[PDB]
UniProtKB/Swiss-Prot annotation, chain A:
GO BP of this protein: co-transcriptional RNA 3'-end processing, cleavage and polyadenylation pathway; mRNA processing
Renumbered ranges of motif Nuclear localization signal: 687-697
Post-translational modification: The N-terminus is blocked.
Entry protein name: Cleavage and polyadenylation specificity factor subunit 1
Organism, as annotated: Homo sapiens (Human)
Lineage, opening ranks: Eukaryota, Metazoa, Chordata, Craniata, Vertebrata
Superkingdom of origin: Eukaryota
Curated annotation (Swiss-Prot), chain B:
Complexes and interactors: Component of the cleavage and polyadenylation specificity factor (CPSF) complex, composed of CPSF1, CPSF2, CPSF3, CPSF4 and FIP1L1. Interacts with FIP1L1. (Microbial infection) Interacts with influenza A virus NS1 blocks processing of pre-mRNAs, thereby preventing nuclear export of host cell mRNAs.
Source organism (scientific name): Homo sapiens
Superkingdom of the organism of origin: Eukaryota
Protein's gene: CPSF4
Zinc finger intervals, C3H1-type: 35-61, 62-89, 90-116
Family indicated by similarity: Belongs to the CPSF4/YTH1 family.
Location(s), subcellular: Nucleus
Protein name per the record: Cleavage and polyadenylation specificity factor subunit 4
Job of this protein: Component of the cleavage and polyadenylation specificity factor (CPSF) complex that play a key role in pre-mRNA 3'-end formation, recognizing the AAUAAA signal sequence and interacting with poly(A) polymerase and other factors to bring about cleavage and poly(A) addition. CPSF4 binds RNA polymers with a preference for poly(U).
Length: 1199, 116
RNA sequence: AAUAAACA
């Protein structure tokens, strides 16, 4: 009954985008947002991985952002953000220095039932606009209530202008904008006071209107100055034209207006569908035939507007201006095509952003050509798993033979991302699976190091045994070396490179050798009473640390280079536990060219950062091993094992602090913070970041920095659950697990002749593995992904298991030409004969592809193209019973498809059962061994809407019936049916229980006996429910019915006949309620990694790019965390002032039983002092909860 | 294919236990009903069922050779006192009235039997 | 068999 929701993939895809002063007033910063996540991107121009959008901060909300505007308030040093959340919550937030989080300035809750005027079902979204002078800002709550926020505390109390109690009876708002010029915040408001529909224009010709209301802030009145009242009936968004021209452009579907207060109306028509539909005086735009219904636009400084249409076509509208600053005529130019957008932003002049849900939302660059036509170039593209319509689990085809006999399933998912011109398949695969190119069995060694000996190949591989040291001469073929040079008679605790790869320095417990490769220059004995346990390295600096805490410094000097003893002046009040060195190729560590820094952690809980040529104290945390969320300087205790400072990103810019503190990983960012202490200190701080990783099962290191492995720099975090830390020029931190080969002891970058830039690690069982990262994925997204651009809307995907191929339904856009009638004898097809100034409707022709997993190209001579008007409603992988193979089932690909020809033609359908059969390939094309064998293709008696399999029976949905066909040799013989509800658009089933899903009415569970050929209704839902798709929550004995909704919900139904609140087995009952942030169409189960013997993780991929999960639990482990969650909900400073309890409510009783693993993840984020307090306040210790929250992370580490 | 990875063939769910012994099906009201949408009771085929007339699920009898023509559209007043069959096998339909009596048929997709 | 054909 109980579950935990955990969000495996953050939602990629941007619904809102702006360009504001988020971090300070000096630089503007592209703040973009999506569904329940904010992103702030900087702008590089000199990047190695050329312009590139570098992420600077990202923020998760407990609520979907419904609009976003920004305004620099009175005397503020930053730009606030007016967010807007569902059911009319405004939230003015700001970035804060110090703590690198947000900071809520104000919370405005407008969810009063008298502000609705009875309208329960909120259809209008709350829309936030700002006055460009920063005088006020207005939210349109619920369509009918202008909430005005006056500005100057930096604020004034709001008020709610009633819209319907104005003049002109506005009553159906379309868009509202703050206009330019003026002395008061004038707000233009498009509306429709007598509403009509495109499709009913012969009695209601043109009803759109405009009121430019002028807000008096102090007196709190509002004159309705300037109204026009016979604008065309289908006007989409309004747009405020800036100051030097003023006014407004009002996008209509088939026209485009320019309106102003002192100027007569001027608007042209963009096709000949404005003939009998508009009485407004429309001219004829020459050489243009397009439409503007979903068309995002922004303005070039003056008189140039970039319209991206539907279809992703960028037009740069020129408003031709007279000498009296009035618009005379328009001027289009068909500029380049680009992403199917949902937003638009002018950045730095000459850069545009195209925020899009469905497509990689990318950064453009326009230039002037040699009037003023602009040519576009794509500079960077934010990767964007789009609205995942369907997604299927597949097995990868390049698993190396060493990992072959592994007990866990090893699989990936293929995701139908995008839409239309940006449609795709995306290959999502959570972990990293290396390519083992050469293995070795070298027992006895436990650490490993790589150096470079003479464009930088790893010359040696240095192993340390318990009593000896190996040498591995690399080259054409690697071989153990026996000659002089290295100290092979004892162990080594460090071996690395000094200078710039000109000398090799290993650290024996007695001393240190200087090596030019195989030859040694000299030896310096270390006469400390304690043996050396570890070291760290800079380019000229060698820092030794003994067992008793004694620290010495070595330093190169020219002559030939030789190390010199240098004693550090240190005050040893308490013994040093562990060290780390660091340098600044690109430095924020200013304390006011490489500036070297020495980190040093003392056993009294402190932490010290020194500039390395001197030894002066620059930073000091008093109580370090607690895990405090912000490390601010001040210039039992859990043991600190290893500390790592490494620079990641473009040209070694941003540092991170990885520390290991007693079976707990907590790593820090690093960000500037100017601190007025005067004596010379670090003007930086450290912010802790969330994780998923636990360290629970000479000195061995677990933090191994690697540069230039498959183009990437970063840190491989070793241990019991190994992880990768990848930061590209994007600047975003990526945590990719590596659960194959078990736990990992050591690691090294490896660059060879026969091996490419790859890596090299120990198994736990002492197996040295030369390995290469697989080269087809991209490890820069939150999961490793390869994008497969189909350039046509992928509707479905179906991994055919036998012969191991994918079968994708697609659709491209063909301009329609015929209108099917049905006049009494047969179909008659009226040819569309219209003007040459006419745009055509879209006819979509469907074809079923065949994508091969080996190399991800499609397969030629395998494309089932359907009829003229036939639309695929479903593709699945269907297992039907047969007497050929040794089993019963076979595993076909069945697809249902029906003909859409408008509401006057009876839609009929056709079950298309296929089969992928390996034939001999064509010589030269080894992909072409795969080819369809269409068994069944016969027209049915109605539209085929959904397919399912039940013990080898085909279960299909035709009309208000659900059919059960069986596959004979060539014909389908019907066996069972039931007259079901309206439109069954999803059915999945298991063990003869059919779970249907209507669009409006109800899900049903059905049941098929074999001995009596009968399908029947066992239990249905009785209430109306606007389903998207359904699933199967599986417990040890309970089967839950996970059913997503239109209203971004999840809910688990169960069939409980002994319960009295339903009828006796005739009504389903929901037993968990949850509110996902996003719509969900895809659903699948997996076995998780005695408890968890028989429970399944029923994952899903949301329709905003994110992938979630619902791991079932028991009653005891749930309520030890619901006590935590209620303690986490109240006693924490949530982002933007949001309430995580009320956001994850059902949004109709809300019988919630599903936790939030993104709020419970904050308990893993608290410091261990703060951790113990909330444990005592609920009545436990942290170690019971950490045994409960890390076991919901371990069993969910698939893909 | 959902049955290689997350297979559930070895699970005896509480859902399957709920539908063998029927788990508390109420004896249906109003004894002039139809028992429509209900599959079959296994208590009648093996042995005595227990309740007669007022029972939820369907009770079958032999010697039914022709499927019911009204039942296909979803109009079964008779229910289990029907003298015609309630499967979906397309071999036990009646002869079509207009092919047997009035020469040829009229529609193109006549389901009913055409014998000569 | 109880309206399969109830047509303009
Ligand atoms: Zn019975
Ligand atoms: Zn009947
Ligand atoms: Zn007939």
């Amino acid at each position: 009954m109980y579950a935990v929701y955990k969000q495996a993939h953050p939602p990629t895809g941007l619904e809102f985008s702006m360009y504001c002063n988020f971090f300070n007033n000096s630089e503007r910063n592209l703040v973009v947002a999506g569904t329940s996540q904010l992103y702030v991107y900087r702008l590089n121009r000199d990047a190695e991985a050329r312009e590139k959008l570098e992420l600077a901060a990202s923020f998760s909300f407990f609520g979907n952002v419904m609009s976003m505007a920004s305004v620099q308030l009175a005397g503020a040093k930053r730009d606030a953000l007016l967010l807007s959340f569902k059911d009319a919550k405004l939230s003015v937030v700001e970035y804060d220095p110090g703590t690198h989080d947000l900071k809520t300035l104000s919370l405005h809750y407008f969810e009063e039932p008298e502000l609705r005027d009875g309208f329960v079902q909120n259809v209008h979204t709350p829309r936030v606009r700002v006055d460009p002078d920063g005088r006020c800002a207005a939210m349109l709550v619920y369509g009918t209530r202008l909430v005005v926020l006056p500005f100057r505390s930096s604020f004034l109390p709001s008020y709610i202008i009633d819209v319907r109690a104005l003049d002109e009876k506005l009553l159906n708002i379309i868009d509202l904008q703050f206009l330019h010029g003026y002395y008061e915040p004038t707000l233009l408001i498009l509306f429709e006071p007598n509403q009509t529909w495109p499709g009913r224009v012969a009695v209601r010709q043109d009803t759109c209107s405009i009121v430019a209301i002028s807000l008096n802030i102090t007196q709190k009145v509002h004159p309705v100055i300037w109204s026009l009242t016979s604008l065309p009936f289908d006007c989409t968004q309004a747009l405020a034209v800036p100051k030097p021209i003023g006014g407004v452009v009002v996008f209509a579907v088939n026209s485009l207006l320019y309106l102003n207060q002192s100027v007569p109306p001027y608007g042209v028509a963009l096709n000949s569908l404005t003939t009998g539909t508009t009485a407004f005086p429309l001219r004829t735009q020459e050489g243009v035939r397009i439409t503007l219904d979903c068309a995002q636009a922004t303005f070039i400084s003056y008189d140039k507007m970039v319209i991206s249409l539907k279809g992703g076509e960028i037009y740069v509208l020129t408003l031709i201006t007279d000498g009296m600053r009035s618009v005379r005529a328009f001027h289009f130019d068909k500029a380049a095509a680009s992403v199917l957008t949902t937003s638009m932003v002018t950045m730095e002049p000459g850069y545009l952003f195209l925020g899009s849900r469905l497509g990689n939302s990318l950064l453009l660059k326009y230039t002037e050509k040699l009037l003023a036509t602009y040519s576009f170039e794509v500079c960077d593209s934010i990767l964007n798993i789009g609205p995942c319509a369907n997604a299927a689990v597949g097995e990868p085809a390049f698993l190396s033979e060493e990992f072959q006999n592994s007990p866990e399933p090893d699989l990936e998912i293929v995701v139908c991302s995008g839409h239309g011109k940006n449609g795709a398949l995306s290959v999502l695969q959570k972990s990293i699976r290396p390519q083992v190119v050469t293995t070795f069995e070298l027992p006895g060694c436990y650490d490993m190091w790589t150096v470079i000996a003479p464009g930088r190949r790893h010359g040696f591989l240095i192993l340390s045994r318990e009593d000896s040291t190996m040498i591995l001469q690399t080259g054409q073929e690697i071989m153990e070396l026996d000659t002089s040079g290295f100290a092979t008679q004892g162990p080594t605790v460090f071996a690395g490179n000094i200078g710039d790869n000109r000398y090799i320095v290993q650290v024996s417990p007695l001393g240190i050798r200087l090596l030019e490769g195989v030859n040694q220059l000299h030896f310096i004995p270390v006469d400390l009473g304690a043996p050396i346990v570890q070291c760290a390295v800079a380019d000229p600096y060698v820092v030794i640390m003994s067992a008793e805490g004694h620290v010495t410094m070595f330093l190169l000097k020219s002559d030939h280079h030789r190390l010199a003893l240098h004693k550090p002046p240190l005050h040893h009040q308490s013994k040093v536990i562990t060290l780390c060195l660091y340098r600044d190729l690109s430095g924020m560590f200013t304390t006011e060219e490489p500036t070297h820094w020495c980190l040093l952690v003392r056993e009294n809980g402190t932490m010290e950062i020194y500039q390395l040529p001197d030894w002066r104290l620059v930073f000091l945390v008093k109580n370090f091993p607690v895990g405090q969320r912000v490390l601010v300087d001040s210039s039992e205790l859990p043991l600190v094992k290893e500390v790592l400072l490494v620079a990641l990103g473009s040209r070694q810019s941003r540092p991170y602090l990885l520390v290991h503190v007693d079976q707990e990983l907590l790593i820090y960012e690093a960000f500037p913070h100017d601190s007025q202490l005067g004596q010379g200190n670090l003007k930086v701080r450290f912010k802790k970041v969330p994780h998923n990783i636990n360290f629970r099962e000479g000195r061995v290191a677990r933090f191994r920095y690697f540069e230039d492995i498959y183009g990437y720099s970063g840190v491989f975090i070793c241990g019991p659950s190994p992880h990768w830390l990848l930061v590209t020029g994007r600047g975003a931190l990526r945590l990719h697990p590596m659960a194959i080969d078990g736990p990992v002891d050591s690691f090294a970058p490896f660059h060879n002749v026969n091996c490419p830039r790859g890596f090299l690690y120990f198994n736990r069982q002492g197996e040295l593995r030369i390995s290469v990262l697989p080269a087809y994925l991209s490890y820069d997204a939150p999961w490793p992904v390869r994008k497969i651009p189909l350039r046509c809307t992928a509707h479905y995907v179906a991994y055919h298991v036998e012969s191991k191929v994918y079968a994708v339904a697609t659709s491209t856009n063909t301009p329609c030409a015929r209108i099917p009638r049905m006049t009494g004898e047969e179909k008659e097809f009226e040819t569309i004969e219209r003007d040459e100034r006419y745009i055509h409707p879209q006819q979509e022709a469907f074809s079923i592809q065949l994508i091969s997993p080996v190399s991800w190209e499609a397969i030629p001579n395998a494309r089932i193209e359907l009829q003229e008007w036939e639309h695929v409603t479903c593709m699945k992988t269907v297992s039907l019973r047969s007497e050929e193979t040794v089993s019963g089932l076979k595993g076909y690909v069945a697809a249902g498809t029906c003909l859409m020809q408008g509401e006057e033609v009876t839609c009929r359908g056709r079950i298309l059962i296929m089969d992928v059969i390996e034939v001999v390939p064509e010589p030269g094309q080894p992909l072409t061994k795969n080819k369809f064998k269409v068994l069944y293709e016969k027209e049915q008696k109605g539209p085929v809407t959904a397919l399912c399999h039940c013990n080898g029976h085909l279960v299909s949905a035709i009309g208000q019936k659900i059919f059960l066909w069986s596959l004979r040799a060539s014909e389908l013989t019907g066996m069972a049916f039931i007259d079901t509800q309206l439109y069954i658009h999803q059915m999945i089933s298991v063990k003869n229980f059919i779970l249907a899903a209507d669009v409006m009415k109800s899900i049903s569970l059905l049941r098929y006996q074999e001995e009596s050929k009968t399908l029947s209704l066992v239990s249905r839902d009785a209430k109306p429910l606007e389903v998207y798709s359904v699933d199967f929550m599986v417990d040890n004995a309970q089967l839950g019915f996970l059913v997503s909704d239109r209203d971004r919900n999840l809910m688990v139904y169960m069939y409980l006949p002994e319960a009295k609140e339903s009828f006796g087995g005739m009504r389903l009952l929901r037993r968990a309620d949850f509110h996902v942030g996003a719509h969900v169409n895809t659903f699948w189960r997996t076995p998780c990694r005695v408890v968890w013997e028989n429970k399944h993780i029923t994952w899903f991929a949301t329709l905003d790019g994110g992938i979630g999960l619902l791991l079932p639990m028991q009653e005891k482990t749930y309520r030890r965390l619901l006590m935590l969650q209620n303690a986490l909900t109240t006693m924490l400073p949530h982002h933007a002032g949001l309430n995580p309890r009320a956001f994850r409510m059902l949004h109709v009783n809300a019988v919630r039983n599903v936790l939030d693993g993104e709020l419970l993840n904050r308990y893993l984020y608290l410091s261990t002092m703060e951790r113990s307090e909330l444990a005592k306040k609920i009545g436990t210790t942290p170690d019971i909860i950490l045994d409960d929250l890390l076991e919901t992370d371990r069993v969910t580490a698939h893909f | 294919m959902q049955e290689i990875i997350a297979s559930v063939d070895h699970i005896k769910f509480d859902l399957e236990i709920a539908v063998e012994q029927q788990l508390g099906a109420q004896p249906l009201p109003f004894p002039g009903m139809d028992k429509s949408g209900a599959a079959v009771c296994e208590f009648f085929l093996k042995a005595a069922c227990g309740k007669g007339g007022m029972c939820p699920f369907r009770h079958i009898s032999g010697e039914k050779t022709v499927v019911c023509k009204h039942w296909l559209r979803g109009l079964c007043k008779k229910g289990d006192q029907c003298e015609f069959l309630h499967e979906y096998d397309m071999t036990k339909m009646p002869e079509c009235y207009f092919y047997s009596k009035f020469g040829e048929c009229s529609n193109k997709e006549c389901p009913f039997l055409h014998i000569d």
